[PDB]
Short mmCIF file of N, CA and C in Angstrom, two decimals:
data_model
loop_
_atom_site.label_atom_id
_atom_site.label_comp_id
_atom_site.label_asym_id
_atom_site.label_seq_id
_atom_site.Cartn_x
_atom_site.Cartn_y
_atom_site.Cartn_z
N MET A 1 5.06 12.65 14.01
CA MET A 1 6.31 13.41 14.83
C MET A 1 6.98 14.14 13.38
N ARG A 2 7.80 15.19 13.87
CA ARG A 2 8.71 16.00 12.92
C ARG A 2 9.17 15.07 11.98
N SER A 3 9.90 14.13 12.65
CA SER A 3 10.78 12.95 11.99
C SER A 3 10.21 12.52 10.76
N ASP A 4 9.15 11.66 10.92
CA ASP A 4 8.39 11.10 9.96
C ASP A 4 7.90 12.05 8.79
N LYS A 5 7.67 13.28 9.35
CA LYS A 5 7.26 14.35 8.45
C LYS A 5 8.25 14.35 7.50
N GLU A 6 9.34 14.10 7.84
CA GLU A 6 10.52 14.20 6.75
C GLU A 6 10.69 13.40 5.66
N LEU A 7 9.77 12.29 5.29
CA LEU A 7 9.66 11.46 4.32
C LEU A 7 9.89 12.40 3.01
N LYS A 8 10.89 12.09 2.16
CA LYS A 8 11.09 12.66 1.04
C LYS A 8 10.35 12.13 -0.29
N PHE A 9 9.23 12.90 -0.88
CA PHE A 9 8.51 12.72 -1.94
C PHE A 9 9.02 12.97 -3.26
N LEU A 10 8.76 12.07 -4.51
CA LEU A 10 8.96 12.90 -5.52
C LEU A 10 7.55 12.61 -6.51
N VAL A 11 7.29 13.84 -7.01
CA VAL A 11 6.12 13.90 -7.82
C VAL A 11 6.42 13.91 -9.01
N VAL A 12 5.88 12.98 -10.03
CA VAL A 12 6.17 12.65 -11.33
C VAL A 12 5.18 12.97 -12.29
N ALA A 13 5.22 13.96 -12.98
CA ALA A 13 3.93 14.24 -14.04
C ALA A 13 4.35 15.19 -14.99
N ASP A 14 3.82 15.06 -16.31
CA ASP A 14 4.13 15.82 -17.63
C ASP A 14 3.46 17.09 -17.05
N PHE A 15 2.16 17.03 -16.78
CA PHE A 15 1.48 18.43 -16.74
C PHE A 15 1.70 18.99 -15.35
N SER A 16 2.17 20.33 -15.39
CA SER A 16 2.68 21.17 -14.34
C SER A 16 1.42 21.24 -13.27
N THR A 17 0.38 21.51 -14.06
CA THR A 17 -0.90 21.74 -13.03
C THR A 17 -0.87 20.45 -12.09
N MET A 18 -0.72 19.26 -12.64
CA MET A 18 -0.84 18.33 -11.74
C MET A 18 0.16 18.22 -10.54
N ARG A 19 1.51 18.48 -11.07
CA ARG A 19 2.43 18.49 -10.08
C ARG A 19 2.24 19.47 -9.17
N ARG A 20 1.56 20.67 -9.33
CA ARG A 20 1.18 21.70 -8.61
C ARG A 20 0.17 21.10 -7.48
N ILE A 21 -1.05 20.77 -7.90
CA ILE A 21 -1.86 20.31 -7.07
C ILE A 21 -1.53 19.28 -6.07
N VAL A 22 -0.98 18.17 -6.54
CA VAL A 22 -0.30 17.08 -5.52
C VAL A 22 0.64 17.79 -4.63
N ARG A 23 1.60 18.73 -4.91
CA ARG A 23 2.56 19.30 -4.09
C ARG A 23 1.86 20.39 -2.97
N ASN A 24 0.67 20.86 -3.34
CA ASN A 24 -0.20 21.51 -2.33
C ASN A 24 -0.85 20.70 -1.28
N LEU A 25 -1.45 19.50 -1.86
CA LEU A 25 -2.24 18.55 -0.96
C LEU A 25 -1.19 18.05 -0.10
N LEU A 26 0.09 17.73 -0.32
CA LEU A 26 1.21 17.02 0.54
C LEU A 26 1.57 18.11 1.61
N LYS A 27 1.60 19.59 1.08
CA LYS A 27 1.98 20.46 1.86
C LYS A 27 0.72 20.90 3.10
N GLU A 28 -0.50 20.46 2.93
CA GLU A 28 -1.46 20.65 3.78
C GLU A 28 -1.54 19.51 4.67
N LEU A 29 -0.84 18.37 4.42
CA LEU A 29 -0.88 17.22 5.16
C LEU A 29 0.42 17.24 6.08
N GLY A 30 1.39 18.26 5.76
CA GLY A 30 2.66 18.12 6.45
C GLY A 30 3.94 18.06 5.84
N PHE A 31 3.88 17.52 4.88
CA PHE A 31 4.92 16.83 3.85
C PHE A 31 5.66 18.02 3.09
N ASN A 32 6.53 18.62 3.54
CA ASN A 32 7.39 19.77 3.04
C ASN A 32 8.59 19.31 1.78
N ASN A 33 8.83 18.23 2.16
CA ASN A 33 10.13 17.56 1.67
C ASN A 33 9.70 16.84 0.17
N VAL A 34 9.37 17.67 -0.74
CA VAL A 34 8.86 17.22 -1.94
C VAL A 34 9.66 17.82 -3.22
N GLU A 35 9.91 16.68 -4.19
CA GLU A 35 10.55 17.07 -5.25
C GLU A 35 9.80 16.53 -6.62
N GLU A 36 10.12 17.36 -7.96
CA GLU A 36 9.17 17.11 -8.84
C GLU A 36 10.11 16.47 -10.10
N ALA A 37 9.48 15.82 -11.07
CA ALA A 37 10.04 15.29 -12.19
C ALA A 37 9.02 15.22 -13.40
N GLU A 38 9.46 15.28 -14.65
CA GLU A 38 8.51 15.48 -15.53
C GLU A 38 8.27 14.40 -16.73
N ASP A 39 9.09 13.10 -16.37
CA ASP A 39 8.98 11.79 -17.07
C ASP A 39 9.54 10.87 -16.45
N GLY A 40 9.35 9.54 -16.83
CA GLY A 40 10.17 8.63 -16.18
C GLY A 40 11.55 8.72 -16.23
N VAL A 41 12.27 9.13 -17.29
CA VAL A 41 13.69 9.11 -17.17
C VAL A 41 14.27 10.25 -16.28
N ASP A 42 13.61 11.41 -16.17
CA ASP A 42 13.93 12.53 -15.43
C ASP A 42 13.77 12.01 -13.75
N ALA A 43 12.62 11.25 -13.76
CA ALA A 43 12.42 10.67 -12.39
C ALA A 43 13.46 9.65 -11.86
N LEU A 44 13.81 8.68 -12.68
CA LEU A 44 15.07 7.77 -12.54
C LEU A 44 16.40 8.61 -12.17
N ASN A 45 16.51 9.59 -13.02
CA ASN A 45 17.89 10.43 -12.45
C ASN A 45 17.96 10.92 -11.47
N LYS A 46 16.64 11.20 -10.99
CA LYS A 46 16.72 11.81 -9.64
C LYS A 46 16.53 10.93 -8.52
N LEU A 47 15.92 9.74 -8.68
CA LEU A 47 15.74 8.60 -7.69
C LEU A 47 17.09 7.92 -7.49
N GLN A 48 17.94 7.78 -8.81
CA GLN A 48 19.09 7.09 -8.46
C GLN A 48 20.29 7.69 -7.67
N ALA A 49 20.11 9.08 -7.49
CA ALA A 49 20.89 9.80 -6.41
C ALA A 49 20.57 9.27 -5.05
N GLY A 50 19.45 8.58 -4.68
CA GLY A 50 19.00 8.17 -3.67
C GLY A 50 18.52 8.96 -2.53
N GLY A 51 17.80 8.41 -1.72
CA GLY A 51 17.50 9.28 -0.59
C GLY A 51 15.66 9.98 -0.67
N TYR A 52 15.17 9.13 -1.41
CA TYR A 52 13.68 9.42 -1.64
C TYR A 52 12.96 8.28 -0.76
N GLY A 53 11.73 8.62 -0.43
CA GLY A 53 10.96 7.77 0.40
C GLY A 53 9.60 7.34 -0.24
N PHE A 54 9.46 8.19 -1.32
CA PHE A 54 7.71 8.01 -1.77
C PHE A 54 7.72 8.20 -3.04
N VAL A 55 7.24 7.83 -4.25
CA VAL A 55 7.31 7.93 -5.54
C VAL A 55 5.55 8.22 -5.77
N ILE A 56 5.26 9.34 -6.51
CA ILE A 56 3.75 9.43 -6.84
C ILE A 56 3.87 9.65 -8.41
N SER A 57 3.34 8.85 -9.34
CA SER A 57 3.62 9.32 -10.58
C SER A 57 2.33 9.09 -11.54
N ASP A 58 2.38 9.89 -12.38
CA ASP A 58 1.15 10.22 -13.40
C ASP A 58 1.07 8.76 -14.35
N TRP A 59 0.31 8.93 -15.33
CA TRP A 59 0.27 7.45 -15.96
C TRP A 59 0.92 7.90 -17.40
N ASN A 60 0.53 8.74 -18.16
CA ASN A 60 1.02 9.00 -19.65
C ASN A 60 1.94 10.20 -19.40
N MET A 61 3.07 9.91 -19.83
CA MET A 61 4.22 10.85 -19.74
C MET A 61 5.10 10.58 -21.22
N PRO A 62 5.89 11.52 -21.52
CA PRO A 62 6.56 11.24 -22.90
C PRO A 62 7.97 10.66 -22.23
N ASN A 63 9.02 10.13 -23.21
CA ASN A 63 10.16 9.61 -22.96
C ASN A 63 10.12 8.09 -22.29
N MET A 64 9.33 8.12 -21.09
CA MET A 64 9.19 6.88 -20.19
C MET A 64 7.93 7.21 -19.50
N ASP A 65 6.84 6.34 -19.62
CA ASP A 65 5.61 6.83 -18.92
C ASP A 65 5.51 6.04 -17.51
N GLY A 66 4.62 6.24 -17.02
CA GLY A 66 4.41 5.61 -15.54
C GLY A 66 4.57 4.20 -15.33
N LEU A 67 4.11 3.49 -16.22
CA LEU A 67 3.85 2.06 -16.13
C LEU A 67 5.24 1.55 -16.39
N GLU A 68 5.92 1.90 -17.18
CA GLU A 68 7.39 1.70 -17.52
C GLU A 68 8.16 2.05 -16.39
N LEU A 69 7.86 3.25 -15.64
CA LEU A 69 8.71 3.76 -14.74
C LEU A 69 8.66 2.82 -13.64
N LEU A 70 7.38 2.37 -13.25
CA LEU A 70 7.04 1.54 -12.09
C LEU A 70 7.99 -0.03 -12.16
N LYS A 71 7.89 -0.59 -13.48
CA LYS A 71 8.48 -1.73 -13.66
C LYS A 71 9.99 -1.51 -13.68
N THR A 72 10.59 -0.46 -14.09
CA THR A 72 11.95 -0.01 -13.95
C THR A 72 12.45 0.09 -12.35
N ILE A 73 11.58 0.71 -11.62
CA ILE A 73 11.83 0.90 -10.33
C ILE A 73 11.73 -0.76 -9.65
N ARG A 74 10.64 -1.41 -9.89
CA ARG A 74 10.43 -2.52 -9.21
C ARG A 74 11.80 -3.65 -9.42
N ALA A 75 12.66 -3.44 -10.29
CA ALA A 75 13.33 -4.44 -11.12
C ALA A 75 14.85 -3.73 -10.76
N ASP A 76 14.83 -2.67 -10.21
CA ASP A 76 16.14 -2.08 -9.68
C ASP A 76 16.41 -2.70 -8.17
N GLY A 77 17.30 -3.33 -7.96
CA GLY A 77 17.66 -4.04 -6.70
C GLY A 77 17.68 -2.88 -5.38
N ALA A 78 18.28 -1.67 -5.55
CA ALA A 78 18.10 -0.71 -4.63
C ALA A 78 16.93 0.01 -4.79
N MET A 79 16.09 0.18 -5.76
CA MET A 79 14.83 0.72 -5.89
C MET A 79 13.82 -0.17 -5.52
N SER A 80 13.79 -1.45 -5.42
CA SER A 80 12.54 -2.15 -5.58
C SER A 80 11.73 -2.23 -4.67
N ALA A 81 12.06 -1.65 -3.24
CA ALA A 81 11.24 -1.22 -2.18
C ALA A 81 10.67 -0.13 -2.17
N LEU A 82 10.70 0.75 -2.97
CA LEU A 82 9.89 2.19 -3.09
C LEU A 82 8.52 2.19 -3.09
N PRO A 83 7.89 2.93 -2.08
CA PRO A 83 6.32 2.85 -2.20
C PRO A 83 6.08 3.63 -3.45
N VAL A 84 5.25 3.12 -4.43
CA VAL A 84 4.79 3.94 -5.62
C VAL A 84 3.34 4.06 -5.62
N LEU A 85 2.96 5.28 -5.66
CA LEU A 85 1.40 5.37 -5.83
C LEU A 85 1.28 6.05 -7.39
N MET A 86 0.20 5.17 -8.20
CA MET A 86 0.05 5.51 -9.39
C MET A 86 -1.27 6.48 -9.60
N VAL A 87 -1.20 7.47 -10.48
CA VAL A 87 -2.51 8.25 -10.63
C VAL A 87 -2.96 7.58 -12.07
N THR A 88 -4.39 7.42 -11.96
CA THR A 88 -4.82 6.89 -13.27
C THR A 88 -6.07 7.59 -13.66
N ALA A 89 -6.43 7.40 -14.82
CA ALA A 89 -7.72 8.01 -15.31
C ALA A 89 -8.99 7.17 -15.12
N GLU A 90 -10.15 7.76 -15.17
CA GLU A 90 -11.56 6.91 -14.98
C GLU A 90 -11.59 6.30 -16.44
N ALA A 91 -12.49 5.21 -16.37
CA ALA A 91 -12.91 4.60 -17.59
C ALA A 91 -11.69 3.56 -18.15
N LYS A 92 -10.68 3.71 -17.24
CA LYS A 92 -9.59 2.87 -17.48
C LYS A 92 -9.32 1.95 -16.24
N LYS A 93 -9.93 0.70 -16.30
CA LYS A 93 -9.84 -0.38 -15.15
C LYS A 93 -8.57 -0.97 -15.50
N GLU A 94 -8.29 -1.14 -16.81
CA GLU A 94 -7.21 -2.08 -17.43
C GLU A 94 -6.18 -1.22 -16.76
N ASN A 95 -6.04 -0.07 -16.67
CA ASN A 95 -4.85 0.31 -16.11
C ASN A 95 -4.85 0.17 -14.59
N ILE A 96 -5.96 0.04 -14.03
CA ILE A 96 -5.79 -0.44 -12.33
C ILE A 96 -5.18 -1.85 -12.36
N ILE A 97 -5.68 -2.57 -13.20
CA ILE A 97 -5.09 -4.03 -13.14
C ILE A 97 -3.72 -4.07 -13.44
N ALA A 98 -3.36 -3.33 -14.58
CA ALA A 98 -1.96 -3.40 -15.02
C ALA A 98 -0.96 -2.91 -13.81
N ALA A 99 -1.29 -1.76 -12.90
CA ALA A 99 -0.60 -1.34 -12.03
C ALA A 99 -0.52 -2.23 -10.70
N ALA A 100 -1.53 -2.94 -10.75
CA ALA A 100 -1.60 -3.92 -9.57
C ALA A 100 -0.57 -5.18 -9.98
N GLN A 101 -0.80 -5.33 -11.08
CA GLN A 101 0.32 -6.69 -11.59
C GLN A 101 1.69 -6.05 -11.56
N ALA A 102 2.04 -4.73 -11.88
CA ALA A 102 3.15 -4.21 -11.77
C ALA A 102 3.93 -4.07 -10.64
N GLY A 103 3.21 -4.01 -9.48
CA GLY A 103 3.68 -3.77 -8.10
C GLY A 103 3.51 -2.50 -7.72
N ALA A 104 2.27 -1.73 -8.09
CA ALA A 104 2.13 -0.50 -7.58
C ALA A 104 1.72 -0.56 -5.95
N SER A 105 2.29 0.23 -5.19
CA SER A 105 1.91 0.25 -3.75
C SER A 105 0.37 0.62 -3.94
N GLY A 106 -0.32 1.32 -4.69
CA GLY A 106 -1.40 1.70 -4.53
C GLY A 106 -1.80 2.68 -5.90
N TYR A 107 -3.19 3.05 -5.89
CA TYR A 107 -3.35 3.94 -7.05
C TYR A 107 -4.43 4.96 -6.80
N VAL A 108 -4.63 6.03 -7.43
CA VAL A 108 -5.52 7.02 -7.21
C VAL A 108 -5.98 7.54 -8.55
N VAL A 109 -7.54 7.61 -8.71
CA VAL A 109 -8.02 7.98 -9.95
C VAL A 109 -8.41 9.60 -9.89
N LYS A 110 -7.98 10.25 -11.05
CA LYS A 110 -8.05 11.60 -11.23
C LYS A 110 -9.40 12.02 -12.14
N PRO A 111 -9.86 13.26 -11.62
CA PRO A 111 -9.44 13.89 -10.73
C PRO A 111 -9.88 13.56 -9.39
N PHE A 112 -8.99 13.97 -8.37
CA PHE A 112 -8.96 13.48 -6.92
C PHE A 112 -9.28 14.43 -6.07
N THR A 113 -9.87 14.44 -4.91
CA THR A 113 -9.83 15.39 -3.98
C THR A 113 -8.81 15.49 -2.89
N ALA A 114 -8.63 16.23 -2.19
CA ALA A 114 -7.71 16.12 -0.93
C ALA A 114 -7.91 15.08 -0.22
N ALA A 115 -8.90 14.74 0.31
CA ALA A 115 -9.55 13.81 0.98
C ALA A 115 -9.21 12.49 0.31
N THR A 116 -9.31 12.25 -0.74
CA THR A 116 -9.16 11.07 -1.28
C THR A 116 -7.45 10.45 -1.09
N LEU A 117 -6.63 11.58 -1.70
CA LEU A 117 -5.28 11.32 -1.81
C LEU A 117 -4.88 10.95 -0.35
N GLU A 118 -5.16 11.81 0.72
CA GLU A 118 -4.78 11.16 1.84
C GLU A 118 -5.23 9.98 2.45
N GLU A 119 -6.49 9.65 2.19
CA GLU A 119 -7.13 8.43 2.24
C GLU A 119 -6.10 7.21 2.02
N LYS A 120 -5.70 7.42 0.46
CA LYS A 120 -4.75 6.28 -0.07
C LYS A 120 -3.48 6.62 0.44
N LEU A 121 -2.79 7.69 0.84
CA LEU A 121 -1.51 7.72 1.36
C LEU A 121 -1.64 6.98 2.78
N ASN A 122 -2.55 7.33 3.51
CA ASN A 122 -2.48 6.57 4.70
C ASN A 122 -2.50 4.96 4.93
N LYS A 123 -3.52 4.42 3.77
CA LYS A 123 -3.59 3.09 3.62
C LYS A 123 -2.21 2.26 3.35
N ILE A 124 -1.41 3.09 2.44
CA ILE A 124 0.03 2.57 2.19
C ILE A 124 0.91 2.85 3.49
N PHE A 125 0.81 3.69 3.96
CA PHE A 125 1.94 3.76 5.36
C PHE A 125 1.60 2.68 6.38
N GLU A 126 0.24 2.29 6.36
CA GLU A 126 -0.04 1.17 7.26
C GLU A 126 0.65 -0.14 6.99
N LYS A 127 0.21 -0.70 5.52
CA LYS A 127 0.95 -1.93 5.09
C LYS A 127 2.52 -1.97 4.91
N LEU A 128 3.15 -0.91 4.74
CA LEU A 128 4.40 -0.82 4.82
C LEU A 128 5.17 -0.66 6.28
N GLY A 129 4.42 -0.13 6.87
CA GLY A 129 5.08 0.43 8.44
C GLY A 129 5.64 1.63 8.49
N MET A 130 5.11 2.73 8.54
CA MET A 130 5.74 4.09 8.54
C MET A 130 4.84 4.77 9.38
#
């Protein structure tokens, strides 16, 4: 429905190209309420204003990385409920375990196709009920 398509996303990544790819895939899926941030600090400044419903973060970023962003989110009372999808690089399963242990709603490995992202997004929406 139009209503659920209203879910507000925050895409967090140092690389503009990455933010562009994700933002287009979201648009292909019908989600137009998308915002961007370039590091963990910029993201927290936007999240604290509230009213966000889903966060997608890349892993390596300056100032505050993705893992650190995730722990910060999970430790904040008002934010601990946010669904958070972590993007990680291949050859780094340690990153996958780390994200699971920190409370990531899910992870997606890059590069990823339009199909994979949707696949992971849908799995998350079932678990939390959306």
